[PDB]
Amino acid sequence: DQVKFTNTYWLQQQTKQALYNGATPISFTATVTADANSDSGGDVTVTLSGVPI
Amino acid sequence: YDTTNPQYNSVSRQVEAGDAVSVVGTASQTMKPNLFYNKFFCGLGSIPLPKLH
């Protein structure tokens, strides 16, 4: 699955300016590596591929 | 807008106290404008650097 971090945008990797596809800015998104289930109290631990450095 | 010097008027009337203005955009949105210009809008140069002793 893909999780999207809403207020944090991708950059152009050389220039370091935020990306904009003309409607909105394109937010950063990462991918779940392995299946992860949530325990009581409602909090999840997950490993993601792609990093918001 | 120059009464003594109308030669240089850029605009139709004079901005006066109480005139309505507005901003172009939406409050906090981050965006990436396209540009248009003419060759003589801006210019660029570079200064040759001497070498340290």
Side-chain angles (χ1 to χ4, degrees), chain B residues 36-44:
Chain B
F36 68 103
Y37 56 90
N38 170 304
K39 193 176 188 63
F40 298 43
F41 168 56
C42 287
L44 183 65

Side-chain angles (χ1 to χ4, degrees), chain A:
Chain A
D1 296 351
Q2 285 171 322
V3 177
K4 193 167 66 63
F5 292 82
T6 294
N7 292 341
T8 308
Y9 310 126
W10 291 99
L11 257 46
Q12 163 154 350
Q13 300 302 317
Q14 185 71 58
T15 298
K16 310 297 180 184
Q17 309 299 116
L19 293 186
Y20 181 77
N21 71 357
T24 58
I26 306 164
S27 60
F28 171 78
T29 186
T31 307
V32 179
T33 287
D35 294 344
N37 46 335
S38 68
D39 56 10
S40 65
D43 45 355
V44 187
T45 299
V46 63
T47 297
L48 299 170
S49 176
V51 281
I53 302 159

Side-chain angles (χ1 to χ4, degrees), chain B residues 7-52:
Chain B
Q7 290 159 308
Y8 295 102
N9 289 347
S10 179
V11 82
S12 67
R13 58 184 287 277
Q14 186 169 1
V15 176
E16 180 181 358
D19 292 345
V21 302
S22 61
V23 188
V24 173
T26 305
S28 289
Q29 307 299 95
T30 167
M31 69 182 82
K32 179 178 285 184
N34 300 284
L35 299 181
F36 68 103
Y37 56 90
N38 170 304
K39 193 176 188 63
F40 298 43
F41 168 56
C42 287
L44 183 65
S46 69
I47 297 94
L49 297 179
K51 55 166 293 183
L52 303 178

